[PDB]
Design a protein around this ligand. Structure first.
Ligand SMILES: *[C@@H]1O[C@H](CO)[C@@H](O)[C@H](O)[C@H]1NC(C)=O
Lengths: 30, 50
């Protein structure tokens, strides 16, 4: 992919090893 | 690593166990500044730099 040019100063790096897909994103209290 | 290129490891998202750290007696010096070695397991921190 070509999503970013550079990545640095990582704080939190988490990895996980006919249809409607719904998400609700909420940023509260950090 | 040598002192000039001292290794820096970020530690986060873990459940620490300092009991192993201060129980082992191989460490000649275990000086803690600003925190109580006995009371460490009670406290929570954002992140650690080793
Ligand atoms: C964070 O900023 C730049 C860009 O990510 C990074 O190279 C640098 O090491 C970091 N500097 C500080 C002061 O955190």
């Amino acid at each position: 992919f070509r999503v970013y040019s550079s990545a640095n100063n990582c704080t939190f790096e988490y990895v996980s090893q006919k249809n409607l897909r719904e998400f609700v994103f909420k940023n509260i209290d950090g | 690593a040598s002192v000039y290129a001292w290794n820096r490891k970020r530690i986060s998202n873990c459940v620490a166990d300092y009991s192993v750290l201060y129980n082992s007696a191989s460490f000649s010096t275990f000086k803690c500044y600003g925190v109580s070695p006995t009371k460490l397991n009670d406290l929570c921190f954002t992140n650690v730099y080793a």
